[PDB]
């Protein structure tokens, strides 16, 4: 009942949710179900990337920039 209304991505199960979606898409032989699962996985990946960018906007990104320019 809690997970019914509570949306899935929050918060640490992003990787687990993506793996479950990928497994469901692989298991489902249908076309519409596979497309929907693929779209959901892509949306989850984009959301995770945006969240990481927001969190890694400073320091975590500048360090990568300095490392690449130094190499």
Partner 1 sequence: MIIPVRCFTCGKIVGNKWEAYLGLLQAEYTEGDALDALGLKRYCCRRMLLAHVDLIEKLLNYAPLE
Partner 2 sequence: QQPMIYICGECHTENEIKSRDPIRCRECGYRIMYKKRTKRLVVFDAR
Partner 3 sequence: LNGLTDRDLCELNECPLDPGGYFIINGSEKVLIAQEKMATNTVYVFAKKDSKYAYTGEC
CA-angle at 33, arms to 32 and 34, nearest 5°: 90
End-to-end CA distance of the chain: 52
Stretch that binds partner 3, among 1-9, 26-34, 44-52, 57-65 (CB under 8 A): 44-52
Q: Which residues contact 17 (CB under 8 A, 6 or more apart)?
A: 8, 9, 44
Map residues 4-43 to x or -, x wherever contact with partner 1 holds by CB under 8 A. ------xxx-------------------------------
Taking the C-alpha atoms of residue 58 and residue 29, their distance in angstroms, rounded to an integer, is 43
Of residues 5 through 34, those in contact with partner 2 by CB under 8 A are: 6, 11-13, 16
Contact flag: residue 51 with partner 2 (CB under 8 A): no
Interaction site with partner 1 (CB under 8 A):
10-12, 55, 59-60, 62-63, 65-66, 69-70
């Amino acid at each position: 009942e809690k997970e019914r209304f509570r949306k899935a991505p929050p918060n640490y199960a992003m990787k687990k949710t993506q793996l479950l979606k990928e497994k469901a898409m692989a298991e489902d032989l249908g076309d519409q179900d596979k497309a929907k699962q693929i779209q959901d996985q892509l949306n989850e990946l984009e959301e995770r990337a945006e969240a990481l960018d927001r969190q890694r906007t400073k320091n975590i990104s500048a360090i990568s920039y300095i490392n690449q320019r130094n190499r």
